[PDB]
Design a protein around this ligand. Structure first.
Ligand SMILES: NS(=O)(=O)c1ccc(C(=O)O)cc1
Ligand SMILES: NS(=O)(=O)c1ccc(C(=O)O)cc1
Length: 164
């Protein structure tokens, strides 16, 4: 079936716990595969050790810039960027996992976890999974954000990988 992956997250070195994500490989196989491989690090790069660099309460928690740590970087397993696969899945509510981008067809490695329904992103960001377990951890991360997106604690993905 669809992959299950995990992110173990610290804030200022204190473990927050684990976020488990189901990747909708049945709907968006290319987008799911990129994220899966970046979690395992099997291509020689990925999310381990990188940060949630932009977190906005009552919106979303963004991560995945493992090259520049600031929203400008990241790369996919395919090349620097890859196309929007489809917009079939919608930003239905808290726990949605979706690709960050810089406009059409600019997916790399950056992603966000929604903490509300974000319907205005439908048709603009590729949704590719959802939180299975660990919304408590997501709420903790969210609580360390701000209106500007600046985090008030350093939020690090210490470990990540594939469960099934
Ligand atoms: N003192 S700290 O390392 O900045 C800190 C405090 C609380 C929490 C939490 O609520 O989980 C995480 C980190
Ligand atoms: N809670 S909300 O009014 O839907 C919202 C959405 C986005 C942002 C932001 O980009 O900063 C802030 C608030």
């Amino acid at each position: 079936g669809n992959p299950l992956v995990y992110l173990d997250v610290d804030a200022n070195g204190k473990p927050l716990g684990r976020v488990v994500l189901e990747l909708k490989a049945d709907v968006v196989p290319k987008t799911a595969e990129n994220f899966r491989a970046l979690c395992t690090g099997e291509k020689g790069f990925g999310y381990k050790g990188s940060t949630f660099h932009r977190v906005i309460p009552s919106f979303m928690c963004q991560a995945g810039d493992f090259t520049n740590h600031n929203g400008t970087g990241g790369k996919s397993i395919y090349g620097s960027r890859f196309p929007d696969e489809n917009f079939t899945l919608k930003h239905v509510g808290p726990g949605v996992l979706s690709m960050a981008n810089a406009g059409p067809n600019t997916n790399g490695s950056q992603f966000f976890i929604c903490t509300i329904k974000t319907d205005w992103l439908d048709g603009k960001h590729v949704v590719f999974g959802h939180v299975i377990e660990g919304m408590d951890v997501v709420k903790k991360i969210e609580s360390f954000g701000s209106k500007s997106g600046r985090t008030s604690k350093k939020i690090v993905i210490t470990d990540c990988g594939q469960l099934s």
